[PDB]
Design a protein around this ligand. Structure first.
Ligand SMILES: C/C=C(\C)CC/C=C(\C)CCC=C(C)C
Ligand SMILES: [Mg+2]
Ligand SMILES: [Mg+2]
Length: 536
């Protein structure tokens, strides 16, 4: 049997992550000062008689500095109270910020706060075009719209045109903040990435900066980075022992990239265990994808699918040699999962993640069949299979495994394919097909998402690409709507789904597969998040 040619580039990273020894003295020094700075920060938030604009600017700063995970109660109480006071404020800057912070935290504040800034048609008064800060905040707020927010239909285009016009003459670092926002808005960015940029390129360079807050953010970012470095070391050891880089040389070698993805789903230390489990699944399912996609044969892929469906060690002998590697590693990864959760009595929940992995594999197989036959389904039929081949129902289920508070009713909710999860899956799927379109019409892909769409509707490649853009916009409005209270589960179980959508946007920025081709988009992030500390 003849297999296809290996074209995946090797891991950029070698072994620079394989061993990290925490300087335990440094850590304890950071932690001790952090405790002091934490209380100073708290007392800032609990301070009385602050004006509205100063309270929102404080919370916004703490959030961009990446330290708001320390003050979830205090921030919640202050925004709640702001929500219920429905105060009037005649300042675009403060109104737009009030809107974004409330919406991001689930409070369904009314978009009518923006009507006083519009003319008749509900178009923004162009007299506002010289209010750079107001424009900046309207621009960030315009990314948290729901379907009930068509007052804001114009805010993105209006704020964008005038930020571009103003940017070249703005002072620093405001200029760099605006330029960055136009390339990457806050709401759809990965939080650690946005936080590293804010600390280093913006706040550190602010004439007005608060020194307590800056030192806090620098120390906290560097202290957490040490934890992530440990995790990546241990995950890097795990990957090494499996040695798929030699035994399965057809597969992408990307455990570091998988770690970055999992660090986007959550970065806080309380999710250390969840983070490590999640990375391992991403790795493994990336292997199964390379097998179906650029190596295995029709007959082989079917025995793989059946074996996965059956999910029993007895089945290895039914599969060719190399597939036995994949198969046993998968089954043992899940025995390990069951062991990690024993102590706490949560071993049973592994089966949810398993059922979603079986589903992924089935749909890989269907997609193979469609390719071998040259079948070009209608869009509806394409999606009923290709949504799950994003792995996003699978990764979202996985993300809960390590979260100690995840209950069985939380997994029940996720199994019913709730609206927020589906939106996140749709974003992943259409970003994929827009990016990997051409590159797969080269390898003779006949059932690419875009193709199905053109043939189904009778429309050119462009119009089809714009139709996928619309499903993504619809999907982001659905995610934003899914964060509004009352939430169907704790917000703690909603954020991973939202972060899954962020991860996809950040990895395919500028329409290029950054996981397979990490050097251009993911490499600078991995360096800023996992190599270089923030110079204090
Ligand atoms: C956008 C396309 C994909 C995501 C492919 C399916 C996912 C993987 C093969 C895991 C690595 C990439 C992540 C963004 C988690
Ligand atoms: Mg694939
Ligand atoms: Mg494929």
């Amino acid at each position: 049997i003849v297999r296809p040619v290996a074209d995946f580039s090797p891991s950029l990273w070698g072994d620079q992550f394989l061993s990290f020894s925490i300087k335990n003295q440094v850590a304890e020094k950071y932690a001790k000062e952090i405790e002091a700075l934490k209380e100073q920060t708290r007392n800032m938030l609990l301070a009385t008689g602050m004006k509205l604009a100063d309270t929102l600017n404080l919370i916004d700063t703490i959030e961009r500095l990446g330290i708001s995970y320390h003050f979830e109660k205090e921030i919640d109480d202050i925004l709640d109270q702001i929500y219920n006071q429905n105060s009037n404020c005649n300042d675009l800057c403060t109104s737009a910020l009030q809107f974004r912070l409330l919406r991001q935290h689930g409070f369904n504040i009314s978009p009518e706060i923006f009507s006083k800034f519009q003319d008749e048609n509900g178009k923004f008064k162009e007299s506002l075009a010289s209010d750079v800060l107001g424009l900046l905040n309207l621009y960030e707020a315009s990314h948290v719209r729901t379907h009930a927010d068509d007052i804001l239909e114009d805010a993105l285009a209006f704020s964008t045109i005038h930020l571009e016009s103003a940017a070249p003459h703005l002072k620093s670092p405001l200029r760099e903040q605006v330029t960055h926002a136009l390339e990457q808005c806050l709401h759809k960015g990965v939080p650690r990435v946005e936080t590293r940029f804010f600390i280093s390129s913006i706040y550190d360079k602010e004439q007005s900066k608060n020194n307590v807050l800056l030192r806090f953010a620098k120390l906290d970012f560097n202290l957490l980075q040490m934890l992530h470095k440990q995790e990546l070391a241990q995950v890097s050891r795990w990957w090494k022992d499996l040695d798929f880089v030699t035994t399965l040389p057809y597969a992408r070698d990307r455990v570091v990239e998988c770690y970055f993805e999992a660090l986007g789903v959550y970065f806080e230390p309380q999710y250390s265990q969840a983070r490590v489990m999640l990375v391992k699944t991403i790795s493994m399912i990336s292997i199964v994808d390379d097998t179906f996609d650029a190596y295995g044969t029709v007959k082989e892929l079917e025995a793989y699918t059946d074996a996965i469906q059956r999910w029993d060690i007895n089945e290895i002998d039914r599969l060719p040699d190399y597939m036995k590697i994949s198969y046993k590693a998968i089954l043992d990864l899940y025995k390990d999962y069951e062991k990690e959760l024993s102590s706490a009595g949560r071993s049973h929940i592994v089966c949810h993640a398993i059922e979603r992995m079986k589903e992924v594999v089935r749909n890989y197989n269907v997609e193979s069949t469609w390719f071998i036959e040259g079948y070009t389904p209608p869009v509806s039929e394409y999606l009923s299979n290709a949504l799950a081949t994003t792995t996003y129902y699978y990764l979202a289920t996985t993300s809960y495994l390590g979260m100690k508070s995840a209950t069985e009713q939380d997994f029940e909710w996720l199994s019913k394919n709730p609206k927020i999860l589906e939106a996140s899956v749709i974003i992943c799927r259409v970003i994929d097909d827009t990016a990997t379109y051409e590159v797969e019409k080269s390898r003779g892909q006949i059932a690419t998402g875009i193709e199905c769409c053109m043939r189904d509707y009778g429309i050119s490649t462009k119009e089809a690409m714009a139709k996928f853009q619309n499903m993504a916009e619809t999907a982001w409005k659905d995610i934003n709507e899914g964060l509004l209270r009352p939430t169907p589960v704790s917000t703690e179980f909603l954020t991973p789904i939202l972060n899954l959508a962020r991860i996809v946007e950040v990895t395919y920025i500028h329409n290029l597969d950054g996981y397979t081709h990490p050097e251009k988009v993911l490499k600078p992030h991995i360096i800023n998040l996992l190599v270089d500390s923030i110079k204090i």
